[PDB]
Design an enzyme around this catalytic site. Structure first.
Site, PDB file in Angstrom:
ATOM      1  N   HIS A  44       0.813  -1.205   0.000  1.00 50.80           N
ATOM      2  CA  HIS A  44       0.000   0.000   0.000  1.00 50.80           C
ATOM      3  C   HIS A  44       0.849   1.259   0.000  1.00 50.80           C
ATOM      4  O   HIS A  44       0.283   2.358  -0.057  1.00 50.80           O
ATOM      5  CB  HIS A  44      -1.012   0.023   1.174  1.00 50.80           C
TER       6      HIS A  44
ATOM      7  N   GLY B  61       3.507   6.155  10.044  1.00 54.06           N
ATOM      8  CA  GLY B  61       4.851   5.893   9.551  1.00 54.06           C
ATOM      9  C   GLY B  61       5.477   4.581   9.988  1.00 54.06           C
ATOM     10  O   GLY B  61       6.594   4.262   9.537  1.00 54.06           O
TER      11      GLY B  61
ATOM     12  N   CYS C 271       4.368   1.509   9.344  1.00 58.67           N
ATOM     13  CA  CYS C 271       4.147   0.386   8.450  1.00 58.67           C
ATOM     14  C   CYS C 271       5.471  -0.129   7.925  1.00 58.67           C
ATOM     15  O   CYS C 271       6.395   0.638   7.650  1.00 58.67           O
ATOM     16  CB  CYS C 271       3.223   0.797   7.313  1.00 58.67           C
TER      17      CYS C 271
HETATM   18  C1  ALD Z   1       1.344   2.593   7.864  1.00 59.33           C
HETATM   19  O1  ALD Z   1       2.401   3.437   8.341  1.00 59.33           O
HETATM   20  C2  ALD Z   1       0.029   2.890   8.602  1.00 59.33           C
HETATM   21  C3  ALD Z   1       0.106   2.428  10.061  1.00 59.33           C
HETATM   22  C4  ALD Z   1      -0.977   2.980  10.983  1.00 59.33           C
HETATM   23  C5  ALD Z   1      -0.813   2.388  12.387  1.00 59.33           C
HETATM   24  C6  ALD Z   1      -0.933   4.504  11.007  1.00 59.33           C
HETATM   25  N1  ALD Z   1      -1.053   2.193   7.925  1.00 59.33           N
HETATM   26  C7  ALD Z   1      -2.051   2.848   7.321  1.00 59.33           C
HETATM   27  O2  ALD Z   1      -2.087   4.074   7.274  1.00 59.33           O
HETATM   28  C8  ALD Z   1      -3.140   1.989   6.721  1.00 59.33           C
HETATM   29  C9  ALD Z   1      -3.100   1.916   5.200  1.00 59.33           C
HETATM   30  C10 ALD Z   1      -4.185   1.002   4.644  1.00 59.33           C
HETATM   31  C11 ALD Z   1      -4.168   1.023   3.108  1.00 59.33           C
HETATM   32  C12 ALD Z   1      -4.130  -0.442   5.120  1.00 59.33           C
HETATM   33  N2  ALD Z   1      -4.450   2.467   7.181  1.00 59.33           N
HETATM   34  C13 ALD Z   1      -4.861   2.230   8.415  1.00 59.33           C
HETATM   35  O3  ALD Z   1      -4.251   1.506   9.188  1.00 59.33           O
HETATM   36  C14 ALD Z   1      -6.119   2.912   8.830  1.00 59.33           C
HETATM   37  C15 ALD Z   1      -5.929   3.838  10.028  1.00 59.33           C
HETATM   38  C16 ALD Z   1      -4.991   5.018   9.807  1.00 59.33           C
HETATM   39  C17 ALD Z   1      -5.654   6.120   8.998  1.00 59.33           C
HETATM   40  C18 ALD Z   1      -4.545   5.542  11.174  1.00 59.33           C
HETATM   41  N3  ALD Z   1      -7.081   1.924   9.275  1.00 59.33           N
HETATM   42  C19 ALD Z   1      -7.828   1.179   8.473  1.00 59.33           C
HETATM   43  O4  ALD Z   1      -7.777   1.196   7.251  1.00 59.33           O
HETATM   44  O5  ALD Z   1      -8.753   0.278   9.141  1.00 59.33           O
HETATM   45  C20 ALD Z   1      -9.927  -0.202   8.492  1.00 59.33           C
HETATM   46  C21 ALD Z   1     -11.126   0.713   8.654  1.00 59.33           C
HETATM   47  C22 ALD Z   1     -11.192   1.932   7.985  1.00 59.33           C
HETATM   48  C23 ALD Z   1     -12.308   2.751   8.133  1.00 59.33           C
HETATM   49  C24 ALD Z   1     -13.365   2.356   8.949  1.00 59.33           C
HETATM   50  C25 ALD Z   1     -13.302   1.138   9.620  1.00 59.33           C
HETATM   51  C26 ALD Z   1     -12.186   0.320   9.467  1.00 59.33           C
END
Ligand code: ALD
Ligand code: ALD
Ligand code: CL
Ligand code: NA
Lengths: 301, 305
Positions: free
Chosen positions: B41, B143, B145
Site C-alpha cells: 500500500h 509511519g 508500516c
Molecule cells: C502505515 O504506516 C500505517 C500504520 C498505521 C498504524 C498509522 N497504515 C495505514 O495508514 C493503513 C493503510 C491502509 C491502506 C491499510 N491504514 C490504516 O491503518 C487505517 C488507520 C490510519 C488512517 C490511522 N485503518 C484502516 O484502514 O482500518 C480499516 C477501517 C477503515 C475505516 C473504517 C473502519 C475500518
C-alpha cells in the site's frame, strides 16, 4: 495507538558486550574504545566474599590473569584500574563497534532498557525503572553481572546501570558506569536489605495521561485536589510525594489532553480508594509506575 | 530471579531496516540480500485508497519512483514485483548486514519481538503475541508500516510479521513476509473490525509455571482435573481449548515443578471460577497470556543468541 513497555533497540549495546574471566569467576564486560568496564568483584575468591579488600586483591593481579573474550577473539589486557566498584581493563584493541555514548547517573523513577547477558552474549532486552529504594526489578540469573542499562534518545547511548547483585526479596542492585552504587548497597555478601519500596507517583500520573491519549476516560471525575491534600492521601498508600517539579513536568501532557494535573491527581485518588472494579487501564489491572512522562511523550507522539 | 516481558536482542534486524518513499508516502522496508520488502500500500495515493486495484497501480510505477534510503545512502532500485500484499524491490546492492534468516508463518498464541521503526530508523522493541483473532496488541504511530516481527532460534532470524494497519479498537494487523495477511483482513481503508478475542490457555499455564519457579505459589491446590473437564471451563470463560499437544509441550515445566498440567489446570480452573481474591501473580492482577512455554524456559535458563 497502543501502549507497550518498549525498550530501546539493543544492537548498539550488543556490539559492546564481552566476557571477562578472572580465576573461576566469569561475568560480562562493556567494551568501549580500548577499555573494558566490569564489576570489580570478578577478582574475588570464594574466601573473600564478605570483606574483600579490593585494593589488595587487585595489586596482586597480572594483566594475563584477566581473560577477556569478544566473540571468538581473545582481547589482550595491557593495564587496569579500579574506579569505585568498577574495574577498567585497558585492552590493546579499540572496539570498532563503539557507538556514540555517554555515562549518566540517573534519579529514582527514571527508566532504562536492560540488555541481559551471559558469558558475553545477549539473552534479551526489557525495560526497568530505578525504584525509590534504589533497586531495580530485573530478570537476572547467575552470570548476569556486568549486564548494563541504557537509553538511546536520539543517536547516543547513555549508559546508566551496571548489574552487580541480587538482594533477598529477589530485586537487583548495581552501579552507574563510574562504579558508584545506587542506594546504600556495597559489593560484599554481608547482610543487606532493600528499604520498603514505594510507588512512583509522577509515573502513574503519566500513564493515566497515556490512557486518556489512547482513548480511555472512565477513571476521570468531576473533582480536583490541592497538592498537599493529594500527598496526604497518597502517603497512606505508600506512594512517593508529588512535588511541584513533578507537576511542572506533567504540564505538556496536561496541555495535550485538557486535563489539569491536579484534576488527574483527583482521579488517581479515587482509583486508590476504589480500585478498578473489574476494568483495566491500558491492559493492566494495577496502576503502572514504570513509564515516565518523557516515555509517554516518546511513545504517543 | 525475576521475570520480565523480554524481547529478543534486535541488532541483527536493525541492520536490515531502510526507508522507502513512493510519491508522498514514506514507510519502512526490510533489506535482505538484494531485495527490499515493504507493504504494497506504499503505492496507494491520498486520492485513491478505498478500493485499490493493486495489479493496475503497479504497472504505472517504474523503478526510480521508489526512493530507498539505507541510513543516508540511497539504494538504486533495479526491479519491482508484487507478492500478495508485499512489494519486493530489487536493488543493485546486497545488504552486507544480511543475517542468517528465514521467513516463517506463525500460529495464534505464538509470540515474537517487534522492532518498531519510523523513517527507516529503529525506535523501539517490544514483545507481542499473535492473538487468537489474528491481531496483535502493538504500539504503532503513523509511519510505522513495514516494521517487522521476528524470533531468533540459535543464530537464525525467523521473520514472521510485517505491519500494515490499525483497526478501530486500537489493535494492529499485518502479514507474513510472503504478504499473506494474518486474519480476515484486507489492505484497504474499508470497514473492518477485529473479532472477539480469547485468552491463550497454554500460555497462561506457562506463566503460572514461571510464577512457581520464582516462588509465587499461593494459587496451588490439592486438586486435579481432566482435559475434558477443564476444556468445558475454558470454553465457558472464553479461553482457547487446551489440546493434548499443549499438555505435552508443558511437560518439562511439569517435571521441574512437580505440578502436573492437569494439576495446574485445577489451579487455573479455580482462578477462573473464583478470581484472585485480591492477590497478584508475578506482579500482575490479571492472568498473563503472552508468554509461551518456550519463552518461560528460555528466560528462566538464560539462553543467549
Ligand atoms: C502505515 O504506516 C500505517 C500504520 C498505521 C498504524 C498509522 N497504515 C495505514 O495508514 C493503513 C493503510 C491502509 C491502506 C491499510 N491504514 C490504516 O491503518 C487505517 C488507520 C490510519 C488512517 C490511522 N485503518 C484502516 O484502514 O482500518 C480499516 C477501517 C477503515 C475505516 C473504517 C473502519 C475500518
Ligand atoms: C553476578 O553475576 C551475580 C549476579 C546475581 C544476580 C546472581 N552477583 C553476585 O554473585 C554477587 C557478588 C557480590 C560479591 C556482590 N552476590 C550477590 O548478588 C548475592 C546473592 C548471590 C549469592 C545469589 N547477594 C548478596 O550477597 O546480598 C547481600 C546479602 C547477604 C546475606 C543476606 C542478605 C543479603
Ligand atoms: Cl534521571
Ligand atoms: Na491442583
Amino acid at each position: 495507538s497502543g501502549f507497550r513497555k518498549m525498550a530501546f533497540p539493543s544492537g548498539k549495546v550488543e556490539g559492546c558486550m564481552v566476557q571477562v574471566t578472572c580465576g573461576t569467576t566469569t561475568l560480562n564486560g562493556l567494551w568501549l574504545d580500548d577499555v573494558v568496564y566490569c564489576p570489580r568483584h570478578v577478582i574475588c575468591t570464594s574466601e573473600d566474599m564478605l570483606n574483600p579488600n579490593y585494593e589488595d586483591l587487585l595489586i596482586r593481579k597480572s594483566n594475563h590473569n584477566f581473560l577477556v573474550q569478544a566473540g571468538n577473539v581473545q582481547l589482550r589486557v595491557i593495564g587496569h584500574s579500579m574506579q569505585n566498584c568498577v574495574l577498567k581493563l585497558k585492552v590493546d584493541t579499540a572496539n570498532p563497534k563503539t557507538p556514540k555514548y555517554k555515562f549518566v547517573r540517573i534519579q529514582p523513577g527514571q527508566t532504562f532498557s536492560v540488555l541481559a547477558c551471559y558469558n558475553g552474549s545477549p539473552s534479551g532486552v526489557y525495560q526497568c525503572a530505578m525504584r525509590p529504594n534504589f533497586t531495580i526489578k530485573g530478570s537476572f540469573l547467575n552470570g548476569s553481572c556486568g549486564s548494563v542499562g541504557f537509553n538511546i534518545d536520539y543517536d547516543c547511548v547513555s549508559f546508566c546501570y551496571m548489574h552487580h547483585m541480587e538482594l533477598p526479596t529477589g530485586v537487583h542492585a548495581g552501579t552507574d558506569l563510574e562504579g558508584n552504587f545506587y542506594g546504600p548497597f556495597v559489593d560484599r555478601q554481608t547482610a543487606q536489605a532493600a528499604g520498603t519500596d514505594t510507588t512512583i507517583t509522577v509515573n502513574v500520573l503519566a500513564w493515566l495521561y497515556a490512557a486518556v491519549i489512547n482513548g480511555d476516560r472512565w477513571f476521570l471525575n468531576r473533582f480536583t485536589t490541592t497538592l498537599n491534600d493529594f500527598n496526604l492521601v497518597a502517603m497512606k498508600y505508600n506512594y512517593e510525594p508529588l512535588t511541584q517539579d513533578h507537576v511542572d513536568i506533567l504540564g505538556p501532557l496536561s496541555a495535550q489532553t485538557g486535563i489539569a494535573v491536579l484534576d488527574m491527581c483527583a482521579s488517581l485518588k479515587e482509583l486508590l480508594q476504589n480500585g478498578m472494579n473489574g476494568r483495566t487501564i491500558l491492559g493492566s489491572a494495577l496502576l503502572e509506575d514504570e513509564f515516565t512522562p518523557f516515555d509517554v511523550v516518546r511513545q504517543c507522539s
